[PDB]
Amino acid sequence: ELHFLGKQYKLKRPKYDVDEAKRRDGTYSVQMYVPTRLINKETGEIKEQE
């Protein structure tokens, strides 16, 4: 079972810049990271990660 603890999604600071994105012809964006937990229904090993 995969659980997406979506209330804790963090956001990575934008790379480049607004002006750098404009002058480079790129995109102004951030990266989204959500913590998740894979739960084995039997063994019960939970490998928490982002």
Partner 1 sequence: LLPGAEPTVKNGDRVEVGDVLAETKLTTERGGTVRMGEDNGSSTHREVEIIVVLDTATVKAEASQGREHYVIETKGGQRFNLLAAPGTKVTTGHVVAELIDSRYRTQTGGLLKYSGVEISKKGRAKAKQGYEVTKGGTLLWIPEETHEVNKDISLLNVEDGQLVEAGTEVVKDIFCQTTGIVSVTQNNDILREIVIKPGDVHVLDDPDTAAKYDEGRLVNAGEEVFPGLTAEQLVWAEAVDGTDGPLLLLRPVQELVIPDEPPVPSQDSSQESSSRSIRLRAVQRLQFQDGERIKSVEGVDLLRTQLVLESEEGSSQLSADIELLPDSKDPETLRLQLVIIEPVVIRRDVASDTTHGSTHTELRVKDGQKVKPGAVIACTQIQCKEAGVVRGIQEGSEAVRRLLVERERDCVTLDLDVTAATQLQPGSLIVAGTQLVDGIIAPESGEVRAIAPGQLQLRIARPYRVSQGAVLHVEDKGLVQRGDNLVLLVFERAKQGLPRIEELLEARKPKEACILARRPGVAHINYSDDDAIDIQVIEADGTQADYPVGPGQPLIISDGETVDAGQALTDGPANPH
Closest CA to 48 of 5, 7, 10: 5
Scanning residues 1 to 50, which ones bind partner 1 (CB under 8 A)? 39, 42, 44
Q: What is the closest distance, in whole angstroms, from the C-beta atom of residue 44 to partner 1 in the complex?
A: 5
Nearer to partner 1, 2 or 11 (CB): 2
First to last CA, the chain: 15
The C-alpha angle with vertex 49 and arms to 27 and 35, in degrees rounded to 5, equals 60
Q: What is the closest distance, in whole angstroms, from the C-beta atom of residue 45 to partner 1 in the complex?
A: 11
The site for partner 1 (CB under 8 A) is made up of 39, 42, 44
